[PDB]
């Protein structure tokens, strides 16, 4: 549709059961990312045509250094390399390229991931590939329901995640961060203590009032308002891993303003008020990066 | 004697395999196995749509101890085949979980680990998934000639009588595919390597395909009697890292599996399976899956 800016298909879908994230560095000349990105989004359209019931979406997104090159420095004014927070409590592993694929069918996501790798070829060095899965009752592996207060429905998710006007219209900022859960440590905590750590009840998933939970509770850290206006984000996080090996949450969020994500990280990691998130008692982040997801027509026009 | 629930279900969408060694007292496996099979029954009741099943199976040394040397006459440690071309990684314990729902399998695998606790040392945990059109990652449909329906699957996989009635022998072997090597082959050449056409999945006449084709290696008859097995194999891995097929088969006789391995790996006639051009096995083990009644009678 001329004069408009179409969002990449992976930002908005809700309740998808499976995802693949690929994070990679650029190995050679940045020009190689131009044709590869166009091939990949075309492949996504082909898979959507072949598998209409998968409800597939995907996003290509770029780190600061390569996006500044590809854009000539226009727009994406908030973009920067992911900093450390809490002096290293949240480590930084900023890469050049993020691919996020999500759908109702893991097997379709796998084919799409293979297509991404064929498009980019040896221009990229893959740093990790994570297969996310929705767990029972949409719970995080800790046993708490994850997603309840996420923006709901296309209209509100667009408001929160999608830039509305100007050169970046239809684009979004992305944050990804892989957490490694220590479930043995979690299971040493009583359920009441776990509920004070999160800020919601475990079985029934009821919010515990802000004046009845510690300021270190996760909800107290991240449910932030500025003069009454919530700093909302669109989360796409999923569980990942093996039962006997590494497992946790692959955190992913989209926002039209990087600012909202950063304020939540400054809060969680001790930089705002000297207190940190209680979830650090059982889980820790081991990666972190910021990316810019251009509109689809900005990709299709790379050249 | 009732069969363990994971042998017979067809067309699973996802599986988890856990291979482990015994670190503690062999007697710890008795109570743990009973706990786990009860967990599986509870999960089936909670998730009836999942069509969940699971199997606990034991390596030769531990099974001889748990059984007092009675039955399981064919059981032995997995040897190398082809003098080492197929490696051997025999462990003490196999747990196989399968269903329509990966997330249910994950909860079941956590329950297995809780039941066995620190008596076991996990050596491998593999998450299988059914790919598009039930194809192996090579692009060839996998499973077409597998026994179909409970009647025939019981005939092939489940021991009929005696002390082992309701049990089965299990073989597991992880393969690592090199899809770059595969993709350098023309499609006609790939078809002659497998023995079936790629898109349409039609058998190529045995008289017109190479004797090294996969089907010529594994579709074996003895005076016209097919040496059938029940395969539960699935794709696994990451797109950018290691990926392949996790091969898994059940049979009432270990013999049928072993004859296929001797054929594939050059021991029978000096010829090897043509798929070794692009994929290779990296683990291998044999296990005995007792009936449920036998498990209940352990401790
Ligand atoms: C180990 C990692 C994490 C776990 C297990 C986790 C878990 C949860 C849970 C259980 C909830 C409550 C239900 C819900 O409304 O979704 C929640 C809410 C939320 N989380 Fe997290 N989370 C993690 C990391 C993060 C990070 C890193 C951020 C932000 C940078 C974040 C932002 C949010 C937000 C904004 C909410 C909604 C709060 C509200 O408005 O009520 N989470 N999370
Ligand atoms: C890389 C590993 C393997 C791959 C990709 C593979 C793939 C295939 C394919 C594409 C077929 C044809 C369709 C079908 O009927 O299922 C097939 C058939 C079969 N495979 Fe394999 N296979 C592998 C390993 C093995 C092993 C290790 C064995 C036995 C020990 C085996 C036994 C069989 C049998 C019995 C059949 C049916 C043959 C017939 O009666 O037509 N396969 N396999
Ligand atoms: O709130 N973590 O998706
Ligand atoms: O024939 N391999 O499942
Ligand atoms: Mg709130
Ligand atoms: Mg035949």
Residue numbers in the entry:
A (entry chain B): -2 to 300
B (entry chain A): 2 to 300
Paste lines from the article.
The enzyme investigated in this work originates from the human pathogen Klebsiella pneumoniae and belongs to class B. All structures exhibit a dimeric ferredoxin-like fold typical for dye-decolorizing peroxidases, composed of antiparallel β-sheets with four β-strands connected by α-helices. In all DyPs, the prosthetic group (i.e. heme b) is coordinated by a proximal histidine (His-215), which is hydrogen-bonded with a fully conserved aspartate (Asp-268). The fully conserved distal aspartate is responsible for deprotonation of H2O2, whereas arginine 232 is important for maintaining the distal heme cavity architecture and might support heterolysis of the O–O bond by transiently and electrostatically interacting with the negatively charged distal oxygen atom.
Exchange of Asp-143 by alanine does not change the active-site architecture. However, in D143A, the distal access channel is significantly bigger, whereas the surface exposure of propionate p6 remains similar to the WT protein. In the structures of D143A, a molecule of unknown origin (refined as nitrite) was repeatedly found ligated to the heme iron at a distance of 2 Å. However, the presence of this ligand had no impact on the conformation of the distal residues. However, in D143A, the small effect (+20 mV) seems to reflect the increase in exposure of the heme iron to solvent compared with WT KpDyP. The variant D143A is unique in showing an alkaline transition (pKa = 8.6) to a HS hydroxo state. In the absence of Asp-143, the apparent bimolecular rate constant of Compound I formation is reduced by 3 orders of magnitude at pH 7.0, and the pH independence disappears. In the KpDyP variant D143A, the rate of Compound I formation increases with increasing pH, suggesting the assistance of hydroxide ions in H2O2 deprotonation. In addition, the restricted accessibility via the small distal access channel might contribute to the observed poor reaction rates. This is supported by the fact that in D143A Compound I, the reduction rate of thiocyanate was significantly enhanced due to both higher reactivity and unhampered access, as indicated by the crystal structure of D143A. In any case, during turnover of D143A, Compound II accumulated, suggesting that Compound I reduction rates are significantly higher than Compound II reduction rates (k5 > k6) in this variant.
